[PDB]
Amino acid sequence: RRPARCYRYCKNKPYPKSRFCRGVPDAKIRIFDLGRKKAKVDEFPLCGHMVSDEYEQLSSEALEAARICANKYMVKSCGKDGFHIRVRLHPFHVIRINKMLSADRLQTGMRGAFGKPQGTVARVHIGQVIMSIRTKLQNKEHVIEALRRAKFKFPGRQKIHISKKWGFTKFNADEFEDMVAEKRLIPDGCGVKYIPNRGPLDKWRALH
């Protein structure tokens, strides 16, 4: 395990797991939701998300350790089924390793300098959301403290923002309680379906 000081800010083209790699090991993270997975939309009002500031690469093992720390603080603060955390970031970039000493000079110089697939990292743009936690109205400070504990574990400098939107949907929390009851938005599990007016009339007949 090489340190994260040698795998850092972006310098190469994205090299994903595809037909051409064929040698990448499995990533460290596999799951992304840890809280109440089958939660509805009206259960947890607010959400806080974690905004990056530096155009950097985040490793899957750092994502693993951060989601474990955030899950532990959430189950200590608001208990089981009192939160819903989602890691928005997904690792796809595959770094390469040029290992040597396999204490002698007599194995290989820089003869074939192409790297075997070592691990999986994720390129992060400036302003791209790392994690997002939706909770109750009374759990405002606990999301801030959980993302603060994850801030010391992610590299680089990044900020926090409690979103104006109602959870994971792209609609505003002020217009949510005024607009989901009258006409448009119908809950679809944890997601929200937005219906336009350019539909067949049978959908409006099935509604109301």
Task: Considering only residues 108 through 147, tell me which ones interact with RNA, judged by CB under 7 A.
Answer: 108-116, 122, 125-126, 128-129
**Least distance to RNA, CB of residue 137, Å:** 21
- Interface positions, 7-66, toward RNA (CB under 7 A): 7-23, 28, 30-33, 37-38, 53-56, 59, 61-62, 64-66
DSSP 176-202: HHHHTTTTS-EEETTEEE---SSS-HH
Spatial contact of 83 and 74, defined as CB atoms under 8 Å apart: yes
**E-strand stretches of 66-193:** 84-87, 93-97, 116-124, 129-135, 158-162, 186-188, 191-193
Determine, following the binding rule CB under 7 A, whether residue 164 of this chain makes contact with RNA. no
**What is each CA distance from 152 to 66, 70, 146, 177, in whole angstroms?**
9, 12, 10, 36
**Least distance to RNA, CB of residue 177, Å:** 20
Nearer to RNA, 53 or 175 (CB): 53
**Least distance to RNA, CB of residue 172, Å:** 13
Closest C-alpha among 81, 78, 85, 73 to residue 138: 78
> Looking at 43-51, 135-143, 172-180, 187-195, which segment touches RNA (CB under 7 A)?
187-195
> Looking at 42-50, 97-105, 159-167, 171-179, which segment touches RNA (CB under 7 A)?
97-105
Determine, following the binding rule CB under 7 A, whether residue 80 of this chain makes contact with RNA. no
Determine, following the binding rule CB under 7 A, whether residue 98 of this chain makes contact with RNA. yes
Paired residues of 192 in beta bridges: 187
